[PDB]
Amino acid sequence: EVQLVESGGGLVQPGGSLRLSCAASGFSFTTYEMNWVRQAPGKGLEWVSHISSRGLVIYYADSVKGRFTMSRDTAKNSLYLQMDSLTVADTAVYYCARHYFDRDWGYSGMDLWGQGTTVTVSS
Amino acid sequence: EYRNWSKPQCGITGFAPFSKDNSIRLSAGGDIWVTREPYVSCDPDKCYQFALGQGTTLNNVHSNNTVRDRTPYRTLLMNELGVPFHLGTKQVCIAWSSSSCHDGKAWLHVCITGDDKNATASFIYNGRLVDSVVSWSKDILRTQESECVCINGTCTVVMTDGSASGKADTKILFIEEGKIVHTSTLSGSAQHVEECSCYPRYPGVRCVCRDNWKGSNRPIVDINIKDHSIVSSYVCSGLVGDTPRKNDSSSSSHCLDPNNEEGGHGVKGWAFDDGNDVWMGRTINETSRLGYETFKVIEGWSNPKSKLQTNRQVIVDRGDRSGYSGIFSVEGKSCINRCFYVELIRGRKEETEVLWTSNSIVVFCGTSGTYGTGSWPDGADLNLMPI
Amino acid sequence: EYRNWSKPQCGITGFAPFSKDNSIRLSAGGDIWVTREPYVSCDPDKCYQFALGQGTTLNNVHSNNTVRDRTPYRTLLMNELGVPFHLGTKQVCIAWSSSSCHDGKAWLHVCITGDDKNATASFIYNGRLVDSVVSWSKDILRTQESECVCINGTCTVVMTDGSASGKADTKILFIEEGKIVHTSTLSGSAQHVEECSCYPRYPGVRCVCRDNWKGSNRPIVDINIKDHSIVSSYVCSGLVGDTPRKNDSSSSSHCLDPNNEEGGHGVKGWAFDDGNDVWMGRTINETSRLGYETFKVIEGWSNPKSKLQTNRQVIVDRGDRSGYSGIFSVEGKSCINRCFYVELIRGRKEETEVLWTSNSIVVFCGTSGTYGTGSWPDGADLNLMPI
Amino acid sequence: EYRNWSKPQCGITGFAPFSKDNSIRLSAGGDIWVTREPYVSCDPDKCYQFALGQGTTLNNVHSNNTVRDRTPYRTLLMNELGVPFHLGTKQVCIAWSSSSCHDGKAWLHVCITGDDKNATASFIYNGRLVDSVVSWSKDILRTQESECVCINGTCTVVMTDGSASGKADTKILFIEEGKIVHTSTLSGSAQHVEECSCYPRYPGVRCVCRDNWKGSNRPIVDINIKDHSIVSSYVCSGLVGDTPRKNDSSSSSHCLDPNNEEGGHGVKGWAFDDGNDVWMGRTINETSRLGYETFKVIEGWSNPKSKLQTNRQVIVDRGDRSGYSGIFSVEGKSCINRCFYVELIRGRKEETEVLWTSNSIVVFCGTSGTYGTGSWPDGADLNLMPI
Amino acid sequence: EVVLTQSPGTLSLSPGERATLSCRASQSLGTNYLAWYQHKPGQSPRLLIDGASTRAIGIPDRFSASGSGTDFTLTVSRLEPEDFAVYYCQHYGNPYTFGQGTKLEIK
Ligand SMILES: *[C@@H]1O[C@H](CO)[C@@H](O[C@@H]2O[C@H](CO)[C@@H](O[C@@H]3O[C@H](CO[C@H]4O[C@H](CO)[C@@H](O)[C@H](O[C@H]5O[C@H](CO)[C@@H](O)[C@H](O)[C@@H]5O)[C@@H]4O)[C@@H](O)[C@H](O[C@H]4O[C@H](CO)[C@@H](O)[C@H](O)[C@@H]4O[C@H]4O[C@H](CO)[C@@H](O)[C@H](O)[C@@H]4O)[C@@H]3O)[C@H](O)[C@H]2NC(C)=O)[C@H](O)[C@H]1NC(C)=O
Ligand SMILES: *[C@@H]1O[C@H](CO)[C@@H](O[C@@H]2O[C@H](CO)[C@@H](O[C@@H]3O[C@H](CO[C@H]4O[C@H](CO)[C@@H](O)[C@H](O[C@H]5O[C@H](CO)[C@@H](O)[C@H](O)[C@@H]5O)[C@@H]4O)[C@@H](O)[C@H](O[C@H]4O[C@H](CO)[C@@H](O)[C@H](O)[C@@H]4O[C@H]4O[C@H](CO)[C@@H](O)[C@H](O)[C@@H]4O)[C@@H]3O)[C@H](O)[C@H]2NC(C)=O)[C@H](O)[C@H]1NC(C)=O
Ligand SMILES: *[C@@H]1O[C@H](CO)[C@@H](O[C@@H]2O[C@H](CO)[C@@H](O[C@@H]3O[C@H](CO[C@H]4O[C@H](CO)[C@@H](O)[C@H](O[C@H]5O[C@H](CO)[C@@H](O)[C@H](O)[C@@H]5O)[C@@H]4O)[C@@H](O)[C@H](O[C@H]4O[C@H](CO)[C@@H](O)[C@H](O)[C@@H]4O[C@H]4O[C@H](CO)[C@@H](O)[C@H](O)[C@@H]4O)[C@@H]3O)[C@H](O)[C@H]2NC(C)=O)[C@H](O)[C@H]1NC(C)=O
Ligand SMILES: *[C@@H]1O[C@H](CO)[C@@H](O[C@@H]2O[C@H](CO)[C@@H](O[C@@H]3O[C@H](CO)[C@@H](O)[C@H](O)[C@@H]3O)[C@H](O)[C@H]2NC(C)=O)[C@H](O)[C@H]1NC(C)=O
Ligand SMILES: *[C@@H]1O[C@H](CO)[C@@H](O[C@@H]2O[C@H](CO)[C@@H](O)[C@H](O)[C@H]2NC(C)=O)[C@H](O)[C@H]1NC(C)=O
Ligand SMILES: *[C@@H]1O[C@H](CO)[C@@H](O[C@@H]2O[C@H](CO)[C@@H](O)[C@H](O)[C@H]2NC(C)=O)[C@H](O)[C@H]1NC(C)=O
Ligand SMILES: *[C@@H]1O[C@H](CO)[C@@H](O[C@@H]2O[C@H](CO)[C@@H](O)[C@H](O)[C@H]2NC(C)=O)[C@H](O)[C@H]1NC(C)=O
Ligand SMILES: *[C@@H]1O[C@H](CO)[C@@H](O[C@@H]2O[C@H](CO)[C@@H](O)[C@H](O)[C@H]2NC(C)=O)[C@H](O)[C@H]1NC(C)=O
Ligand SMILES: *[C@@H]1O[C@H](CO)[C@@H](O[C@@H]2O[C@H](CO)[C@@H](O)[C@H](O)[C@H]2NC(C)=O)[C@H](O)[C@H]1NC(C)=O
Ligand SMILES: *[C@@H]1O[C@H](CO)[C@@H](O[C@@H]2O[C@H](CO)[C@@H](O)[C@H](O)[C@H]2NC(C)=O)[C@H](O)[C@H]1NC(C)=O
Ligand SMILES: *[C@@H]1O[C@H](CO)[C@@H](O)[C@H](O)[C@H]1NC(C)=O
Ligand SMILES: *[C@@H]1O[C@H](CO)[C@@H](O)[C@H](O)[C@H]1NC(C)=O
Ligand SMILES: *[C@@H]1O[C@H](CO)[C@@H](O)[C@H](O)[C@H]1NC(C)=O
Ligand SMILES: *[C@@H]1O[C@H](CO)[C@@H](O)[C@H](O)[C@H]1NC(C)=O
Ligand SMILES: *[C@@H]1O[C@H](CO)[C@@H](O)[C@H](O)[C@H]1NC(C)=O
Ligand SMILES: *[C@@H]1O[C@H](CO)[C@@H](O)[C@H](O)[C@H]1NC(C)=O
Ligand SMILES: [Ca+2]
Ligand SMILES: [Ca+2]
Ligand SMILES: [Ca+2]
């Protein structure tokens, strides 16, 4: 069975760093596009970042741009989010999701989602 | 022994029915491969059908969610034209992209498989793995999905690598007995080139491709099989053949450049030239892959601004599903005939009453005689077939 | 007409994908033989796949508890490379051990069946039962489980008889048109020799075997096809290829003797030499048959104490099941190419959600061009397949 | 081009395993013909298996109550030796009795079908219906149920017509390219002759038949392929081969006449001669068709009262089911080899847990080398198979 | 950008009538790169509609969607107790953007 498991969510004082780590089982990142998506407490799903199957970071949300770094290890099938200079607005539930780029039809849409990991900025 | 395609082109007034496989109808009872992206190619004796199978049959648990195109399990299946892809089908290489030639002596298969970043193209000739190439642009390496063309033992394969909407590196590979003897980078006015339908326009090869980035007209690649010189342009007819495309009244070509009209995606198709006129085929619906019609545009290969049609045929009806189509040439007694195949796609992402995606094929060939009307859909009823 | 393998060895920088059968995925829907211990061999035209079938299909009541290896019902199945073992497969002899040659004129099959104490090897050439031999050590008579090699019509088969952990009598049989013309007892430094992967290193045959008694390095048997003189040694590279084996940080070899490291059991595998370097393949997991990688050890055929890899490839992933692998040589236009096959085992004794055991095959061939990355597992989902 | 069988007979010390079809085991999953009365015959290249199929598969509603032998639906099925009778099997004539030759140029099929009173024998050569004969005795016309023998283009077929327990008219038909050129009435000391196993004992044909009326020894028919002169006698060995038969200690033979011991019914079997000794095969159980053993009786072809076996083999275990067995000869490089086949019957009238009757085949060939022990039953478990 | 305005901020209805959810587009966009998701609190988001007209694998038949250019709509033709959640419309072509949501509540 395919599954995505996020881990790394924790309290961070403002100005800190946390690394989130989404582990994938049942498929390879070498053929799927991977996404980080967040829901702020009280608000709606925001697309944080997107990485291609070919390894390039196509997008970073304007707020996260310059502070977050998204990467992947295709040997362990892991996705990483290095968050630096965390502000209180970045407290949220984080989600790793998966979609596809088809040669014929194109981008498909996020069909596999993780459990989620909570990142809370305190004081 | 070698094949040189030296004869003239046969007089074509239209196309006559040639073959039908009824794959989906037989899949309801019986074990039939789940395929897509088919084509046809002929050795000097008979004709063969090829497809990219998803490594499973249709009445199978593994048939669920087979809409993807790049999996480690897709292989290239080859039968004689007419024999459905039953469980005795020989699968001739690991490939999620493919192309195939016959140079008059042995079959050549170009098979692309592997990771999306680092992909491998194996060149198999006469049952040997003769050569191999890696991605140059470190992207989805892909090829014609139809037959390639050999002249005097030198076969030509068009391979694209790079972004689907942007500048991609397209190369033309000249292969001799499976060994790549030369490689020419694409040069000319065609910006995006994909999934080319090539035919031997002696003394060279002419390919009509798809523009998946900025045009609804089709690109043209003229390969000089001898000097290895490439020329690129666009199909000049005012009735463009890609889909999505604008309605007949509002369409336009440029004969050199993309038209910048509804050019976001496209479908693999074909076209060839009869003097100044162009024989072409496209889907009847301008936005979905529904139906399939072929016709002739008068002065369509030389004049943009021509929308005069004639000799129209309806191969598949307006409300019936079609897909990829392509051309292949057959050596006749005194001339070279042009045939085409249409892929009739059925299943998920457009019909949500099944969990699988598969295709059937319908094959027509040009004729100098007369012909009637008809419509040859797939015919499968998915409301009764197993999910 | 005879085959003499006189050409040099092709320049090998790596291996490119060549074939995949998808047997287990097709077995979920359709009638496919239950097999194990496969291999590949080619006549001068095309290539064939062989397997030892358990006398039943997978969606069968008789598929239950097929983990045994010696039953009166196992036969040798032969198809063209690519065609899955459907019900039309020709089973060419009664055998629970087997090997196969093509001398350029006709196929040779060595087939072992019978009681563990008595056991008979039938030598079948050109569709005739030409010869037969009985067990010499009155134990489990067994053979290469891969292709044998013929040079000038004289084919060579390595057959072992005796204890798996102890001194066993290994012989090399020289066959001419199915008739055994000579038999040489094994002599040299290799103590236990089993399941050899042989290739024509003109002017002779070189076999890389498994040591199932006291070593995790592989034995080497050099057969002089002419003088019938046998030499034995061990693969000298510091990165040993048998499984179970010790970790790369602490593994050793002797280049003459077993290393006495994790040598209790083993797996059938291959290796060959490029000058002083050794091209080899092994499982990625050091203890279970999980994954499969091939690479090149620099000065590995000449020096124990070399652990320098290069040109590593991952044919099957770390978490995907593999099994027996072997080598076969293909005569090219100007040189001799080396290919290998990997057996992907699925089912009981390692996955207890099914009652059967079967295998699929994945075939790669050496290339002088470039290649990418990938992974080609079996792909079957046993949670959904019938038990 | 013609086949004349001129070479000597190969030195035979025993028989080695050659083939197994596993028909019943595969029938549990998959579509396999319901057959019975099989045999084997070889053209100068490879060997083929024939059977009389009941016009249905085993997992079929029509498989119910297929113990009859004479229905309008039985046809003659032919595959290569080894390929199971799947749904792609070519059925070569309408027949509930059959025999088959290969004269070195084309196949000859003798096929008997029709009413029990007025029956028709069609002679088919090279894919043409060349000749036809009607019943002479207006009874169940029947033939060898195994291969016939051709020498210099003249093939010979033994056909019986009349009462099973009484005087029946047996004839030997000499056929040339499908046309019956001569017909000799049987003459000699053999009273009842049925289901003959014939082999080319150059310069003639020697057939060992069954006595279904008054003997448990087997008849012998010596046909002079040239003078068309027939001689008849009985197998002279004291160990008789028919079943039902008396126990070894209390059995007898006459060399000329039926022994009048347990001669009521019988089973089709074989025997041939090595000098004065006789190589023979029979069921292990003396009353039921259970098991199968072959051995050599010393001075058994010339001396009755001889009960001195040697070189005994157990082809099918004593507790397992067998049936019809027969001989066929294979032209070797320097001599003529003798092989036999055993039919392993499974199903109704002896195992009442299924409603069908079918068979599997096991094939052995003579060898000048050594051999071991074993047992190769059918292996089907009828408690779990569909009824 | 293409702010997607999901039109009904909260919808309350009874288990068994129809529910028309709207998604507005600031500027016209390719009508095949829009999707509809269901988020139930405590559960991960689940994709319902793809390409603005294609139901996903496993989604019941109740939900269907339509759209073109700036207008998009999804209707659960006959509601069920479970189908009460937040609904997002997403544009997964360039420029990437989500919606704010519509909450279906039992009333
Ligand atoms: C038995 O079978 C035969 C063969 O299958 C059929 O014959 C074929 O019939 C077709 C259809 O009539 C002929 O197709 C040609 O169509 C051209 C236009 O195509 C029309 O359909 C398309 C798609 O719907 C529209 O795009 C076209 O354009 C329309 O809209 C645009 C604007 O977007 C306008 O600008 C257009 O004017 C249209 O409004 C068309 O509707 C058509 O131009 C072409 O013209 C021929 O016929 C017209 C009159 O119909 C003549 O004036 C013209 O000069 C051409 O005349 C030749 O052909 C006719 C036979 O149709 C001969 O009688 C004349 O002597 C002359 O040779 C044509 O209509 C196709 O050419 C034709 N093929 C043959 C004959 O080989 C039979 O119909 C079929 N009969 C049945 C069903 O029993
Ligand atoms: C696109 O596809 C191509 C083709 O498939 C890929 O190219 C191949 O890449 C592989 C992997 O990098 C190359 O494999 C080689 O690995 C050798 C060591 O084996 C390693 O794996 C095993 C198993 O996991 C480990 O046990 C080893 O680890 C041990 O040693 C390392 C370091 O030594 C320690 O860190 C470990 O803890 C262990 O102790 C290894 O990790 C390796 O020796 C080999 O060597 C090259 O690189 C080293 C420098 O790192 C050089 O010293 C050496 O001379 C070689 O340098 C080459 O590369 C450069 C640049 O290409 C060339 O310019 C030179 O001419 C020379 O060729 C190597 O790393 C494999 O060789 C390579 N094949 C080819 C044909 O290129 C691409 O990776 C892939 N890219 C993608 C994914 O897009
Ligand atoms: C590995 O495989 C090989 C090949 O498969 C086996 O070798 C074969 O073994 C069988 C074993 O019996 C040999 O069969 C021959 O059987 C003859 C018939 O007797 C048997 O059948 C009758 C009917 O079943 C039974 O009743 C017998 O039992 C008794 O009853 C009869 C009378 O009813 C008595 O006569 C007997 O004494 C018993 O009371 C048996 O089952 C048998 O006559 C024949 O004779 C051999 O031995 C006698 C002495 O008894 C000699 O006089 C005679 O010349 C034969 O001796 C030769 O063969 C032996 C090998 O067995 C050599 O060592 C001698 O040098 C000499 O050459 C014999 O028993 C069959 O011949 C043999 N085939 C070969 C060797 O090719 C191995 O057994 C098997 N081994 C393993 C590990 O399982
Ligand atoms: C066809 O393929 C799809 C995609 O794999 C299958 O849908 C998925 O099915 C699995 C197994 O049923 C679902 O996992 C589930 O997890 C939950 C725990 O949250 C558990 O309660 C369920 O019993 C199940 O194990 C998975 O979520 C579901 N996913 C999707 C995308 O719908 C489907 O089962 C296959 N259908 C058929 C008919 O073969
Ligand atoms: C062909 O397509 C064009 C659009 O490219 C249609 O033209 C528009 O049609 C609508 C509806 O009639 C009008 O509201 C617009 O004012 C038209 N705009 C343009 C750009 O002309 C045209 O009507 C279509 N023709 C047919 C017959 O379908
Ligand atoms: C071409 O195909 C489209 C589907 O992409 C058709 O559009 C449908 O039209 C009917 C009304 O005619 C609507 O009820 C459907 O909602 C539309 N969409 C779908 C997805 O079914 C269109 O009519 C077809 N015809 C042409 C020539 O545009
Ligand atoms: C390689 O295997 C050796 C054992 O052959 C490992 O060495 C032992 O490792 C454990 C755990 O670290 C230690 O407690 C022992 O003291 C080590 N003993 C020896 C014999 O050295 C070694 O750690 C393994 N190396 C790796 C990198 O996995
Ligand atoms: C090689 O395979 C073995 C299985 O033989 C793996 O061992 C498993 O490791 C995980 C933890 O990593 C344990 O939870 C399992 O209990 C282990 N055993 C089994 C049978 O699953 C091992 O991790 C693999 N990897 C290597 C390189 O040793
Ligand atoms: C072989 O068969 C004969 C019968 O043909 C058996 O001889 C009879 O056996 C029974 C039981 O021992 C005696 O009651 C009879 O008196 C015997 N009659 C004859 C005709 O001799 C003989 O015993 C059988 N031998 C074996 C070893 O089974
Ligand atoms: C030969 O086969 C017969 C069956 O025809 C066997 O006879 C059976 O013997 C057992 C006891 O040994 C009885 O319980 C059965 O009732 C018998 N009949 C059947 C139909 O099973 C006989 O034992 C076999 N053996 C020989 C050599 O005669
Ligand atoms: C092409 O080949 C044919 C037959 O092989 C030959 O007759 C013809 O002259 C060739 N054409 C050219 C241009 O060489
Ligand atoms: C094809 O072959 C013929 C004969 O060799 C030659 O005359 C002609 O130039 C060739 N044309 C090519 C290379 O396309
Ligand atoms: C091997 O055979 C080829 C062709 O049969 C021949 O050209 C070559 O000389 C042979 N090699 C030797 C060493 O005899
Ligand atoms: C094979 O035969 C050829 C020709 O007789 C000979 O030259 C060559 O040495 C032979 N090779 C071997 C090693 O048998
Ligand atoms: C039988 O045929 C072979 C080859 O056809 C021939 O050599 C032999 O002499 C023939 N025998 C007789 C007796 O004519
Ligand atoms: C068979 O044919 C050969 C050649 O014609 C002849 O010598 C021989 O006598 C013939 N034998 C028979 C049995 O007819
Ligand atoms: Ca386009
Ligand atoms: Ca070992
Ligand atoms: Ca009798």
Q: DSSP states of C197-214 as a string?
A: EEEEETTEEEEEEE-SSS
For residue E30, the chain B residues in CB contact (below 8 A) are 264
Closest CA to A107 of E60, E33, E24: E33
Ramachandran region, residue C213 (left: φ > 0; alpha: ψ -120 to 50; beta: rest): alpha
End-to-end CA distance of chain D: 49
**Residue D374 near residue C72 (C-beta atoms within 8 A):** yes
B195 is in an annotated binding site: yes
Q: Whose CA is nearest to atom 10 of ligand 4?
A: A1
Mark out chain E residues that contact chain A at CB-CB < 8 A. 32-33, 35, 37, 39, 44-47, 50-51, 56-57, 86, 88, 90, 92-93, 96-101
Measured CA to CA, the distance from residue E65 to residue E28 in angstroms comes to 18
Half-sphere exposure of D77 (CA within 13 A, CB side): 25
Verify whether residue D69 is a known catalytic residue: yes
DSSP H or E stretch at residue E81: none
Chain-chain contact of B68 with A54 (C-beta, under 8 angstroms)? no
For residue B352, the chain E residues in CB contact (below 8 A) are 54-55
Question: Residue D153 has what DSSP assignment?
Answer: T
CB atoms within 10 A of CB B90: 16
Chain-chain contact of C63 with D29 (C-beta, under 8 angstroms)? yes
Q: Take residue C297 and report the two structure tokens written for it.
A: 């050890």
Closest CA to B66 of B93, B34, B97, B30: B34
**Residue C104 near residue C3 (C-beta atoms within 8 A):** yes
Measured CA to CA, the distance from residue C139 to residue C28 in angstroms comes to 38
DSSP secondary structure of D166-210: S-EEEEEEEEETTEEEEEEE--SS----EEEEEEEETTEEEEEEE
Measured CA to CA, the distance from residue C54 to residue C42 in angstroms comes to 24
The 3-class secondary structure across chain B, one letter per residue, is CCCCCCCCECCCCEEEEEEECCHHHHHCCCCEEEEEEEEEEECCCCEEEEEEEEEEECCCHHHCCCCCCCCCCCEEEEEECCCCCECCCEEEEECCEEEEEECCCCEEEEEEEECCCCEEEEEEECCEEEEEEECCCCCCCECCCCECEEECCEEEEEEEEECCCCCEEEEEEEEECCEEEEEEECCCCCCCCEEEEEEEECCEEEEEEECCCCCCCCEEEEECCCCCCEEEEECCCCCCCCCCCCCHHHCCCCCCCCCCCCCCCCCCCEEEEECCEEEEEECCCCCCCEEEEEEEECCCCCCCCCCCEEEEEEEEEEEEECCCEEEEEEECCCCEEEEEEEEEEEECCCCCCCCCEEEEEEEEEEECCCCCCCCCCCCCCCCCCCC
Residues 84-123 of D with CB under 8 A from C: 84, 86, 88
**Shortest alpha-carbon distance between residue C374 and chain A (Å):** 8
Q: Take residue D84 and report the two structure tokens written for it.
A: 């199971």
B350 is in an annotated binding site: no
Measured CA to CA, the distance from residue C33 to residue E72 in angstroms comes to 52
Q: List residues near ligand 16 (CB under 6 A).
A: D 4, 151-152, 203, 225-226
Chain centroid to CA C146: 4
User: Following CA atoms B204, B206, B212, B218 in sequence, which dihedral angle do they give, to the nearest 10 degrees?
Assistant: 150
Closest CA to C345 of C331, C334, C356: C356
Measured CA to CA, the distance from residue C197 to residue C38 in angstroms comes to 12
In units of Å, what resolution does this entry have? 2.8
Question: Residue E51 has what DSSP assignment?
Answer: T
Measured CA to CA, the distance from residue B48 to residue B82 in angstroms comes to 8
The Cα-based distances of C126 to B220, B307, C151, C184 in angstroms read 53, 66, 17, 25
Closest CA to C202 of C223, C174, C217: C223
Instruction: Work out the burial of residue C252: count CB atoms within 10 Å of its CB; fewer than 13 is exposed, 13-18 middle, 19 or more buried.
Output: middle
Nearest Cβ partner for C73 among D25, D86, D384: D25
For residue D376, the chain C residues in CB contact (below 8 A) are 72-73, 94, 113
Closest CA to D210 of D242, D176, D168: D242
Measured CA to CA, the distance from residue B48 to residue D90 in angstroms comes to 24
Strand order in the sheet with C194-201: C194-201, C204-210, C219-223, C230-234
- Please name the residue that has the structure tokens 């689907």: B164
Counting as contact any 3 or more CB pairs under 8 A, the partners of C are A, B, D
Closest CA to B340 of B195, B159, B146: B146
Measured CA to CA, the distance from residue B162 to residue D187 in angstroms comes to 88
The reply to whether C82 touches chain B by the CB within 8 Å rule is yes
Half-sphere exposure of B330 (CA within 13 A, CB side): 20
Number of the ligand closest to the Cα of B286: 6
Question: Residue E15 has what DSSP assignment?
Answer: T
**Shortest alpha-carbon distance between residue A111 and chain C (Å):** 20
The Cα-based distances of B304 to A32, B16, D31, D265 in angstroms read 41, 28, 60, 91
**Residue D373 near residue C118 (C-beta atoms within 8 A):** yes
Length of chain D: 387
Closest CA to C172 of C219, C213, C217, C216: C219
B348 is in an annotated binding site: no
Q: Take residue C334 and report the two structure tokens written for it.
A: 């100007």
Determination technique used: cryo-EM
The reply to whether A104 touches chain B by the CB within 8 Å rule is yes
CB atoms within 10 A of CB D135: 22
> A1 C-alpha vs ligand 4 centroid, how far in Å?
8
Half-sphere exposure of E19 (CA within 13 A, CB side): 25
Nearest Cβ partner for B264 among E30, E54, E57: E30
**Residue D123 near residue D180 (C-beta atoms within 8 A):** yes
**Residue D327 near residue D199 (C-beta atoms within 8 A):** yes
Length of chain A: 123
**Shortest alpha-carbon distance between residue B83 and chain C (Å):** 15
Strands A57-60, A3-7: pairing kind = unpaired
Question: Residue D23 has what DSSP assignment?
Answer: H
Strand order in the sheet with C120-125: C97-102, C107-113, C120-125, C128-134
Measured CA to CA, the distance from residue B225 to residue B173 in angstroms comes to 10
Closest CA to B150 of B46, B65, B223: B223
For residue D337, the chain C residues in CB contact (below 8 A) are 128-129
Nearest CA in chain A to E54: A108
Strand order in the sheet with C325-331: C14-20, C357-367, C336-347, C325-331
Task: Determine the 3-state secondary structure of E54 from DSSP.
Answer: strand
Number of the ligand closest to the Cα of B248: 1
Nearest Cβ partner for A54 among B68, B116, B265: B116
Strand partners, D278: D273, D297
Instruction: Work out the burial of residue C57: count CB atoms within 10 Å of its CB; fewer than 13 is exposed, 13-18 middle, 19 or more buried.
Output: buried
The one-letter amino acid at D14: G
Task: Determine the 3-state secondary structure of D322 from DSSP.
Answer: coil
Measured CA to CA, the distance from residue C90 to residue C97 in angstroms comes to 17
- Most B CBs within 10 Å: which of C25, C42, C46, C339, as the mutation test of the B interface? C25
Chain centroid to CA D311: 22
Strand order in the sheet with B204-210: B194-201, B204-210, B219-223, B230-234
B225-230: long-range pairs with CB below 8 Å, 24+? B225/B149, B225/B151, B225/B152, B225/B154, B225/B156, B225/B174, B228/B172, B228/B174, B228/B182, B228/B184, B229/B184, B230/B172, B230/B184, B230/B185, B230/B186, B230/B187, B230/B188
The one-letter amino acid at B380: A
Counting as contact any 3 or more CB pairs under 8 A, the partners of A are B, C, E
C343 is in an annotated binding site: no
Half-sphere exposure of B187 (CA within 13 A, CB side): 7
Chain centroid to CA D247: 24
**Shortest alpha-carbon distance between residue C383 and chain A (Å):** 9
C210 is in an annotated binding site: yes
